[PDB]
Amino acid sequence: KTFKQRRTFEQRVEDVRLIREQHPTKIPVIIERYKGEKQLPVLDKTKFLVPDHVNMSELIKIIRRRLQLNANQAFFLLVNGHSMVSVSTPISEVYESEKDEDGFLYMVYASQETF
Numbered sequence: 001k002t003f004k005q006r007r008t009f010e011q012r013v014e015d016v017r018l019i020r021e022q023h024p025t026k027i028p029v030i031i032e033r034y035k036g037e038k039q040l041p042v043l044d045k046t047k048f049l050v051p052d053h054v055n056m057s058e059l060i061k062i063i064r065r066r067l068q069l070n071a072n073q074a075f076f077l078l079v080n081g082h083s084m085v086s087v088s089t090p091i092s093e094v095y096e097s098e099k100d101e102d103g104f105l106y107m108v109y110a111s112q113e114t115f
């Protein structure tokens, strides 16, 4: 079901190495619905190439636009399994501290803060 489950550590590593060589200015992001989630829809895809200059506040806005949410639907975004300390951090900086050993940046969303 989940991305890590579908692809071998070997395959996730190689894909990240390709994105480096074909989309060098992009952060390779895995974005996934919380397995519990009842309310929000599933995304049309899993793997996103995010411009390395957008901050986390703008990435939340992008995903809310991609889910076509409305103003008063709740949305929470975990990064590397935990809460974002700050939405104003640039995704280039977030990547350098929160990336996985395979080289993706893993995110999970829900309507509840309690995942």
Ligand SMILES: COC(=O)c1ccc(NC(=O)C(F)(F)F)cc1
Binding pocket: 047, 048, 049, 050, 051, 062, 063, 066
């Ligand atoms: C130079 O701009 C692009 O080609 C480009 C890159 C990524 C995305 N999409 C997202 O950030 C996503 F996936 F989170 F919605 C949209 C356009």
Ligand SMILES: [Cl-]
Binding pocket: 022, 023, 024, 025, 026
């Ligand atoms: Cl690029």
